[PDB]
Amino acid sequence: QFNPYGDNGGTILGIAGEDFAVLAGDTRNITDYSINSRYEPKVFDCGDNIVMSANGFAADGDALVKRFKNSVKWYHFDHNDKKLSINSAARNIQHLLYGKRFFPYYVHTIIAGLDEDGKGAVYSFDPVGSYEREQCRAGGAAASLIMPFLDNQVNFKNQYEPGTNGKVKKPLKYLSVEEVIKLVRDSFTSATERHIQVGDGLEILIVTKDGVRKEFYELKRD
Amino acid sequence: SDPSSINGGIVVAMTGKDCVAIACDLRLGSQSLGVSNKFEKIFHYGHVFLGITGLATDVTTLNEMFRYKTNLYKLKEERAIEPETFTQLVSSSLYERRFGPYFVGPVVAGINSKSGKPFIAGFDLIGCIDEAKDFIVSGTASDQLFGMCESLYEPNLEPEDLFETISQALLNAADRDALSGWGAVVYIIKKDEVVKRYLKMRQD
Amino acid sequence: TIMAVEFDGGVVMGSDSRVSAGEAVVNRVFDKLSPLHERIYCALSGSAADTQAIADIVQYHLELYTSQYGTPSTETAASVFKELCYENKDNLTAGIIVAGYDDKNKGEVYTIPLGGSVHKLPYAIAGSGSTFIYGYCDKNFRENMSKEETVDFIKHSLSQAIKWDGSSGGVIRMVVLTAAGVERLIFYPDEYEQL
Amino acid sequence: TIMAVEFDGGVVMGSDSRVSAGEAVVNRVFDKLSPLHERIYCALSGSAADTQAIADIVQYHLELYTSQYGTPSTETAASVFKELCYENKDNLTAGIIVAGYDDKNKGEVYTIPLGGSVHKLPYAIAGSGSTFIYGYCDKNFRENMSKEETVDFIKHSLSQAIKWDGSSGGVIRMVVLTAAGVERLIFYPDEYEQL
Amino acid sequence: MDIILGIRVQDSVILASSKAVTRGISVLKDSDDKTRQLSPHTLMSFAGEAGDTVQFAEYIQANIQLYSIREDYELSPQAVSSFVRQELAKSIRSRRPYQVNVLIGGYDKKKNKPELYQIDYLGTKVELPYGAHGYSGFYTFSLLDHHYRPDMTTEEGLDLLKLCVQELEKRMPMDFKGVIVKIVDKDGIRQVDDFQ
Amino acid sequence: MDIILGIRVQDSVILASSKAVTRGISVLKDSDDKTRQLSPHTLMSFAGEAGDTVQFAEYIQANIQLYSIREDYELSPQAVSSFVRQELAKSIRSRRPYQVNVLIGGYDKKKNKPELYQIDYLGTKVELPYGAHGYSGFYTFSLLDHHYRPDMTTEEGLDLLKLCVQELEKRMPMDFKGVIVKIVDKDGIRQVDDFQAQ
Amino acid sequence: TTLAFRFQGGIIVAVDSRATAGNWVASQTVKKVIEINPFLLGTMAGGAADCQFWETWLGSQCRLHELREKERISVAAASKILSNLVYQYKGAGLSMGTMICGYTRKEGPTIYYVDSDGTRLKGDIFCVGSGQTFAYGVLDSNYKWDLSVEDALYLGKRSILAAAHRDAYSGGSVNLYHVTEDGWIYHGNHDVGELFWKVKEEEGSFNNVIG
Amino acid sequence: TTIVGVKFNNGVVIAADTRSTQGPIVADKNCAKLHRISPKIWCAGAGTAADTEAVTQLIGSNIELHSLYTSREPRVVSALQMLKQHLFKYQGHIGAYLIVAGVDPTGSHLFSIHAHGSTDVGYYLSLGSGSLAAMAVLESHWKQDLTKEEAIKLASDAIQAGIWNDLGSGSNVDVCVMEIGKDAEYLRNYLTPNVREEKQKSYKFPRGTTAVLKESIVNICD
Amino acid sequence: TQQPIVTGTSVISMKYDNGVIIAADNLGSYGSLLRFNGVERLIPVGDNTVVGISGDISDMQHIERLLKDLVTENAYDNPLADAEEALEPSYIFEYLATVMYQRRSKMNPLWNAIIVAGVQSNGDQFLRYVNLLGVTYSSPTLATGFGAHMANPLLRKVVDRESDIPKTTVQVAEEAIVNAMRVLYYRDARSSRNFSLAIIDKNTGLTFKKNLQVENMKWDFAKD
Numbered sequence A: 001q002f003n004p005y006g007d008n009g010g011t012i013l014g015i016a017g018e019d020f021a022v023l024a025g026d027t028r029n030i031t032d033y034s035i036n037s038r039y040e041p042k043v044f045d046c047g048d049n050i051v052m053s054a055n056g057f058a059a060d061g062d063a064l065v066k067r068f069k070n071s072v073k074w075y076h077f078d079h080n081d082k083k084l085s086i087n088s089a090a091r092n093i094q095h096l097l098y099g100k101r102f103f104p105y106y107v108h109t110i111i112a113g114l115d116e117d118g119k120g121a122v123y124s125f126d127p128v129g130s131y132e133r134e135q136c137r138a139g140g141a142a143a144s145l146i147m148p149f150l151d152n153q154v155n156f157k158n159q160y161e162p163g164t165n166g167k168v169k170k171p172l173k174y175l176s177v178e179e180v181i182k183l184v185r186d187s188f189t190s191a192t193e194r195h196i197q198v199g200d201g202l203e204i205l206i207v208t209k210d211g212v213r214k215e216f217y218e219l220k221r222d
Numbered sequence B: 001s002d003p004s005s006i007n008g009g010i011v012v013a014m015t016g017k018d019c020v021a022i023a024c025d026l027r028l029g030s031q032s033l034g035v036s037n038k039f040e041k042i043f044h045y046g047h048v049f050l051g052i053t054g055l056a057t058d059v060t061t062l063n064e065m066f067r068y069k070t071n072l073y074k075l076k077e078e079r080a081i082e083p084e085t086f087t088q089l090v091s092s093s094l095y096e097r098r099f100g101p102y103f104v105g106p107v108v109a110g111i112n113s114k115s116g117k118p119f120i121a122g123f124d125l126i127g128c129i130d131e132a133k134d135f136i137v138s139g140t141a142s143d144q145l146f147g148m149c150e151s152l153y154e155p156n157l158e159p160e161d162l163f164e165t166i167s168q169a170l171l172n173a174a175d176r177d178a179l180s181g182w183g184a185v186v187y188i189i190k191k192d193e194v195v196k197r198y199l200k201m202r203q204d
Numbered sequence C, D: 001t002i003m004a005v006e007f008d009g010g011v012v013m014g015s016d017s018r019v020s021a022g023e024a025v026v027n028r029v030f031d032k033l034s035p036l037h038e039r040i041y042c043a044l045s046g047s048a049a050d051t052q053a054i055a056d057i058v059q060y061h062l063e064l065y066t067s068q069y070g071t072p073s074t075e076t077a078a079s080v081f082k083e084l085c086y087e088n089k090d091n092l093t094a095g096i097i098v099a100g101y102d103d104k105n106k107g108e109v110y111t112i113p114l115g116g117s118v119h120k121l122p123y124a125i126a127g128s129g130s131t132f133i134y135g136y137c138d139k140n141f142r143e144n145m146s147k148e149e150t151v152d153f154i155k156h157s158l159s160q161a162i163k164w165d166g167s168s169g170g171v172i173r174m175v176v177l178t179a180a181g182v183e184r185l186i187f188y189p190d191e192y193e194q195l
Numbered sequence E: 001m002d003i004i005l006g007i008r009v010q011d012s013v014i015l016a017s018s019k020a021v022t023r024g025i026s027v028l029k030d031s032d033d034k035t036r037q038l039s040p041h042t043l044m045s046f047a048g049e050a051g052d053t054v055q056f057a058e059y060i061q062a063n064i065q066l067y068s069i070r071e072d073y074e075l076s077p078q079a080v081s082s083f084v085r086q087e088l089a090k091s092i093r094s095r096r097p098y099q100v101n102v103l104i105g106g107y108d109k110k111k112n113k114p115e116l117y118q119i120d121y122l123g124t125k126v127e128l129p130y131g132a133h134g135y136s137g138f139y140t141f142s143l144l145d146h147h148y149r150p151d152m153t154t155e156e157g158l159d160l161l162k163l164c165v166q167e168l169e170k171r172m173p174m175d176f177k178g179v180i181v182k183i184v185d186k187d188g189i190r191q192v193d194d195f196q
Numbered sequence F: 001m002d003i004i005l006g007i008r009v010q011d012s013v014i015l016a017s018s019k020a021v022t023r024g025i026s027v028l029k030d031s032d033d034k035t036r037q038l039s040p041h042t043l044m045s046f047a048g049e050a051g052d053t054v055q056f057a058e059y060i061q062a063n064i065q066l067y068s069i070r071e072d073y074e075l076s077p078q079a080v081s082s083f084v085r086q087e088l089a090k091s092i093r094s095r096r097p098y099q100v101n102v103l104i105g106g107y108d109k110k111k112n113k114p115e116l117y118q119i120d121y122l123g124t125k126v127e128l129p130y131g132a133h134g135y136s137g138f139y140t141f142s143l144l145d146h147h148y149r150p151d152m153t154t155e156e157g158l159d160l161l162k163l164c165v166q167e168l169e170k171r172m173p174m175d176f177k178g179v180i181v182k183i184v185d186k187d188g189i190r191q192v193d194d195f196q197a198q
Numbered sequence G: 001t002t003l004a005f006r007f008q009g010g011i012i013v014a015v016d017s018r019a020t021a022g023n024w025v026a027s028q029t030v031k032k033v034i035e036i037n038p039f040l041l042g043t044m045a046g047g048a049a050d051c052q053f054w055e056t057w058l059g060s061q062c063r064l065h066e067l068r069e070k071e072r073i074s075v076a077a078a079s080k081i082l083s084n085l086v087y088q089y090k091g092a093g094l095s096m097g098t099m100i101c102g103y104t105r106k107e108g109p110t111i112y113y114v115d116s117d118g119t120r121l122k123g124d125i126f127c128v129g130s131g132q133t134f135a136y137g138v139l140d141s142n143y144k145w146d147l148s149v150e151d152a153l154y155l156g157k158r159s160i161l162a163a164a165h166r167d168a169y170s171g172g173s174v175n176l177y178h179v180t181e182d183g184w185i186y187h188g189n190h191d192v193g194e195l196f197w198k199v200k201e202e203e204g205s206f207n208n209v210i211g
Numbered sequence H: 001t002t003i004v005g006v007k008f009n010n011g012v013v014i015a016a017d018t019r020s021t022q023g024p025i026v027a028d029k030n031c032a033k034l035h036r037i038s039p040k041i042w043c044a045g046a047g048t049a050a051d052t053e054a055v056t057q058l059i060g061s062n063i064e065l066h067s068l069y070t071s072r073e074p075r076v077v078s079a080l081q082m083l084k085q086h087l088f089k090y091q092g093h094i095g096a097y098l099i100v101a102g103v104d105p106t107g108s109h110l111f112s113i114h115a116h117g118s119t120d121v122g123y124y125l126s127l128g129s130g131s132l133a134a135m136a137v138l139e140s141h142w143k144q145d146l147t148k149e150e151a152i153k154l155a156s157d158a159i160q161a162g163i164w165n166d167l168g169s170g171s172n173v174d175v176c177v178m179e180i181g182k183d184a185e186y187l188r189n190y191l192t193p194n195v196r197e198e199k200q201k202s203y204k205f206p207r208g209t210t211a212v213l214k215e216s217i218v219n220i221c222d
Numbered sequence I: 001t002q003q004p005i006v007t008g009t010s011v012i013s014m015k016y017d018n019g020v021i022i023a024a025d026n027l028g029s030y031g032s033l034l035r036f037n038g039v040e041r042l043i044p045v046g047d048n049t050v051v052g053i054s055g056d057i058s059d060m061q062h063i064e065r066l067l068k069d070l071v072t073e074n075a076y077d078n079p080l081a082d083a084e085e086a087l088e089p090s091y092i093f094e095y096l097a098t099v100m101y102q103r104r105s106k107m108n109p110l111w112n113a114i115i116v117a118g119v120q121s122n123g124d125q126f127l128r129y130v131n132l133l134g135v136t137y138s139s140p141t142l143a144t145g146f147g148a149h150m151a152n153p154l155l156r157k158v159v160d161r162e163s164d165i166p167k168t169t170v171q172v173a174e175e176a177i178v179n180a181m182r183v184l185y186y187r188d189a190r191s192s193r194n195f196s197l198a199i200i201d202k203n204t205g206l207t208f209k210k211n212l213q214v215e216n217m218k219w220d221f222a223k224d
């Protein structure tokens, strides 16, 4: 019988700074045990300073990112060049996803940008459009490997002040863009080591008030 | 259905400078229902430590079985079993039930009393030996532990440090697993002495 | 068991005469060669219902074509079959060979297997009995044979397919398409079995 | 694709050289003609595991036969294969041809299909690729051919079976069984494809 | 399922067991004792598949009684639970496993302490302050996580049961026809006849 | 299943209906009224699939209430039962049938006689002296077969139910949390508020 | 794990904050309460998308009722829109268990349980989700009508903590709401992480854990 | 897994990758798949890892016993006949797939065994998820009359095709060389082309970071 | 939902300094029977694009007709059909990618793997893959069916990453492609000796090579 879904592997990771946000993914695309591409980008600049990745079944990923980019173009036409706030993006994607509730997009999607107060923001979505804003989130094949590390090193979970008898929690003092990239690169060197569907390339898109910058790093190719 | 997913539970072992460490959660559940907050998964036979994860009736049975086999060993050999040897006994004991196996993921830790070399190993339920120098992970949050250990672990950690590293790897991986947590215990093993510490952790 | 072969004077079409329902022979003297125009024939293999429904629709399409645009090419006849078999592939179990003679391109043979694909060929074999005669047909087919050699090649080929395939039997019917018109040939067991 | 043919001199056994795991070729150059005795050989088709395990047991039984009662007949070798294949029919997927030569009876060919049945035949085809050469083999085999005629009849036969069957390919090996003894023959693609 | 509770207080173990026996559409009996005395200071309650339940209880009873006469000695509660777990642990990998869950409430005369053992049909043994088998657990565990103290008297422990049995009469879909209650303490096993 | 009882006496019809609503392992409510007033002298009790039960009841109600205003007149119990039977008999051959069983108890002011109709989810209708739906009937029919008389007073009718509910509290495995009891007579519909120990 | 109960002092609403994908813990920082209007709360349990999308859609339909009829929508009529919606999707595989909790002058304080089966029930006490039984356990054995706001808030919090502890598929934190004549008041987010130890000490309960 | 056998003019070499996986997860970044049945008869397996290891040790122990019993060097056709007859008995329920290479008094040999008890022979073989990638390198570069240095090069390059193009295979290359004259030589980590890059950050926690309820010394002695 | 009947095996492809190369054997299989030996699976569109198709052959002939129509349609009211507004590889690919994904979404797929190889009007090499699920990717080497498993490993030794494309000549890349086709004949049971090859070079244009054969096979080691 024909099966309308596949799994093209890969992994994504959003982290929110005070006045910036990063969305990063690997650039590897796989089927079963074969590599399709070592460099097939998966994170996208959709404009109005929003970046988006729809990781999972790459076909449902490409259809969704396509339909959102078109939502952004028609929002400009229909509302006199007004800028699509990240919160408004999120809700629009909810409707995009939920419209296919009984034949879903097999993707876990994240978006990053700035809210209307200039603070960094990360929204993440289940395949049928459940969504929530968050400080950080990893999605895809290695999500179960990285999310625990993010809890520990981004949100300081299970960590306390030395010699306070585990009564004073470590304060949430917040991360610089240099420090966030360090955690992202380690998060991917780790996933690449322990997940066979992760490697080849790491693409990071950084969103500040001055726009969208891209960084690229090699990863192991086994 | 899946015997390895009824009760839940996790074990992890790490090596350090002249020392090993082994930790487990304390949860014993029946699917969604947590039942006991006091079910230890780490046991010892002399100076060889075994953690077990999986179906809790097999965790109990295997412990009783290795105590039996290690007691007879000691009476005949006139010395305690060593980690390298115990690992081979666990391996062969599991492969013996090949077409009816114990639904467990065992983990051995200890220091060879002669050589003083730190040693850890892990097994699948039919007894394949996974011998790594760095760390060994098992249970319903094995995915999360793999990611926590890979990131956090550096070689040649002093016992005091290794204690923070294994504790942080367990706590954070357990908090991302429905079927693990409900308290944890951590053994810090050196040639001469062994310290056992209960960790404060989220009780949900 | 059905086949068409492209020779010097035109093209030749042959078939067994068996209609079966399981292992019961329903008719042992059926005619599986059906005319679509004056010089264009089809050979039917598969479901009796599915093949007969299709042949009737193609016939209609070529009678309407003729009324409007004069004589259709053999290629055209094949394209109508292909279109029906391709678009209804979920509900059809038909294998069809199409053989035609005009004065421009002389003899042509087209084959439309289960999927709905079209294959132009010097000769085509099809049906259950065909599996047994691939080796024979491939070692024995030549281009630019005579009418007498081509009838011989097809008589022998189908003879072996009837012998080996329990889903084939009876008489061998043939149709010869040349400038001169349409010639109907029959060969009975007593002639072809002793080859 | 495997066959044996009974000629004047004695008997010839042929096979392709293909071992496959679905559409993957595991080995393109495998020998499927194993000796049971000095001038008795078997040709194997079916499961690799099942045919090897049975070939080894037949061999063991004929080595013990020879120790106690001397030279076994071909009939006797066929009989042991039958016995295994029949009594273990529920667990075995193996189709076996046995060809041997002694000085009283000369050349003999036995075939043992999935049933566990035995059939003594002038020639024998078996394996996936045989379906395509039934017509060609029936039409081209006659009694009391020479070694060279028989090597040619097999060469052409397996050539066709390889060309049409995707489960068959590689080199044609043959083994010639005469009063002289055993002669091994191999034929590479560049020879047999251009037939 | 049938209702099988137990709770260990300061100086005793209390077992509460439902009195209903139902087959398809009819309650056949409304006064059923889902308990066997194993030895004068050890009591086992049980619930599960129809015949298995008593057949397993009586087989254990026989064996512990035999041991008593042979050694003219009462096995500790720890020893008896260990015996029972091993029988079930064998049972699960046999041709037709015993489908029976049990609580073992005992008073250890050596240590002068009550002990409550919860054991499922897989041979999953654990010692608890309070335990339950089947759907009961879902209501009674969080209830007793609130209202349980370790130094409670036998009287405070009966009150604590009344509170569990009312919650289950209110919120559980099965009419289980109330419970028979037994106390296991230093003087042995007695039945509270007046829980109605 | 839930408990749906009806019994027709001399001058009234008495419907008795379980107060329990149970999803899976939790009794959610213990005071459910499994009945809608269709007209001032016609009452319908219902049990079946979670959603369909009330959706069907309230739909019938609206239609009967509409008919009442349009004709300024109350349909006979016989007429209401025939309307309801036909609605179900359509539902049974539709894409997703209403899985709802009903009793209709009504007092016909033209005939001056009480009437009890039992109708299953297929559109099977019958007039009965006493009726039941689900497992309840396995006990009550043989009970009433013994203790029923057609000339009974409404007061006797209620003792005959108290006898049916005790038998069900004894022998059925479900806790159905007792019954709500309604009388339909020449004076309309009233709820017997003291059945908790009558 | 969600609950709502009615008492002398209005309504108490308490919910956990955990999202699961089987045995994977997806989040511990989730809102399970929709604030529909200053006097209407909706609770979410079941499919994450199904709850969020349709309780947001209820929010729109309620606003549309205010513009049209120049009147705040009744709890009865709000519960019945969601009820009637859900009923159209019956058999299709929607999954939601929800309490519509609100105050109108006409109705007084009112709670409606509505579930994806079509079931719509008025009541004083509901608990909804995988954790419901754990919550009922504590709630049903401490409930009176005559509790103080302070005590009723606590019982609601303490009943979610209870289920957070035992139910593997509940936890993170307790969100608390109080619904009066003057609308809903939010009584804060309480991380089970720190709440459990503060309660176990102060209350002397949870004796089963070593601490 | 990727394993290869290559015959050369005076013996035979085998090679394997060093990656062990639990589903999509890399369990051991460097595990030795190269085992000895006897001093000059080596083994490499794929399929159920407990089955390959277990079946290797059993035939290895029986071969030792047989060696002592006949006062003769173990032969390869013995290890072959024993594996074959054992795997066949268990109808493929023992998920062992092996390449066995070795030298003995009769010459040098290269065979392969599948779970059902089929055996293969050839001048070059391969097995595992990396089978097809390795076989493509072998089919392209193999020639008759290979030297030792050429056969190590060819077998090593076949394992790389696996490491790079197969998700089931990676890390380093193990090689065993068995020459007819000399002792078998085992080159653990012959190639290490997948070294992890130095992390961006040290994750050493300040001491006392973890909350401890209860402490106690454990008694190991009497 | 269908099942493929007459089917074609691996299409293999790679890009080199100045263009792209693509090849595919001339076989139409019918299960295990090697039925049709005259089948072209390289479809040239204009003079800057070749489309290689694997899988169901009837669905291939449908995509053949769709591409001829696309050439016709583009000529309509287009006095620049042979200049600035000629069809591109990127244009032809995005159409097929659209159509494949719609057909999977209607649960009636075209049972194919397609590689579109070409040179764009600005000289850039174009190589991209789409199949019955609508899944798409690019890589300096692409292959379908068996060729993903055997060809990609061999062609990746010549071009591992993007930086190697300016270092690879037509000679080196064509040689790698003909070698890969030989290996596939050795090890793919549904393969043929007879194959077609196409080169799209930004200078020499479109070279389309018919009736090629795998030569220089090693079988001689067999006899022992």
Ligand SMILES: *C(=O)[C@H]1NC[C@@](C)(O)[C@](O)([C@H](CC2CCCCC2)NC(=O)[C@H](Cc2ccc(OC)cc2)NC(=O)[C@H](CCO)NC(=O)CN2CCOCC2)O[C@@H]1C
Pocket: C001, C002, C015, C016, C018, C019, C020, C021, C022, C026, C030, C032, C044, C045, C046, C047, C048, C049, C051, C052, C093, C126, C127, C128, C129, C130, C167, C168
């Ligand atoms: C050579 O290769 C011959 N092989 C023999 C044969 C008989 O199978 C057949 O294909 C022949 C084709 C001609 C076509 C022109 C009409 C006469 C027959 N086929 C049949 O005779 C056909 C067998 C068949 C049935 C069904 C299917 O697939 C569904 C394939 C083949 N016979 C029938 O259909 C009989 C006709 C009774 O009047 N009906 C049934 O078997 C009833 N079945 C219908 C399908 O559902 C099951 C019941 O000739 C070729 C050339």
Ligand SMILES: *C(=O)[C@H]1NC[C@@](C)(O)[C@](O)([C@H](CC2CCCCC2)NC(=O)[C@H](Cc2ccc(OC)cc2)NC(=O)[C@H](CCO)NC(=O)CN2CCOCC2)O[C@@H]1C
Pocket: D001, D002, D016, D018, D019, D020, D021, D022, D026, D030, D031, D032, D044, D045, D046, D047, D048, D049, D051, D052, D093, D126, D127, D128, D129, D130, D167, D168, H114, H116, H118, H119, H120
């Ligand atoms: C001519 O007709 C040839 N056609 C080719 C072929 C392959 O079918 C075969 O029968 C050939 C026979 C030789 C005999 C001498 C020993 C080598 C094999 N058979 C195979 O290659 C065989 C195919 C096969 C497998 C299974 C079954 O039924 C269960 C029938 C045929 N190959 C294998 O068995 C490979 C061996 C790998 O070393 N492995 C598998 O197929 C894997 N398992 C098979 C059981 O199912 C689970 C997977 O030659 C004839 C003459």
Ligand SMILES: *C(=O)[C@H]1NC[C@@](C)(O)[C@](O)([C@H](CC2CCCCC2)NC(=O)[C@H](Cc2ccc(OC)cc2)NC(=O)[C@H](CCO)NC(=O)CN2CCOCC2)O[C@@H]1C
Pocket: A126, A127, A128, A130, G001, G002, G016, G018, G019, G020, G021, G026, G030, G031, G032, G044, G045, G046, G047, G048, G049, G051, G052, G095, G128, G129, G130, G131, G132, G169, G170
């Ligand atoms: C108390 O009883 C809580 N128990 C926790 C929990 C998680 O089970 C749940 O029911 C919760 C409801 C809340 C979650 C937070 C948003 C508001 C709603 N449900 C989930 O978290 C939900 C579980 C679930 C999945 C599937 C189904 O049947 C379809 C029922 C429940 N999680 C999800 O839906 C995840 C979200 C994060 O990944 N996503 C999916 O399951 C995606 N699949 C959904 C089904 O369709 C295919 C895609 O909270 C109660 C109150």
Ligand SMILES: [Mg+2]
Pocket: A191, A192, A193, A194, A195, A196, A197, A198, A199, A220, A222
């Ligand atoms: Mg990797």
Ligand SMILES: [Mg+2]
Pocket: B174, B175, B176, B177, B178, B179, B180, B181, B182, B204
């Ligand atoms: Mg947890």
Ligand SMILES: [Mg+2]
Pocket: D162, D163, D164, D165, D166, D167, D168, D169, I189
């Ligand atoms: Mg072939």
Ligand SMILES: [Mg+2]
Pocket: B035, E118, E119, E120, E124, E125, E126
């Ligand atoms: Mg238990």
Ligand SMILES: [Mg+2]
Pocket: B204, G163, G164, G165, G166, G167, G168, G169, G170, G171
């Ligand atoms: Mg929990």
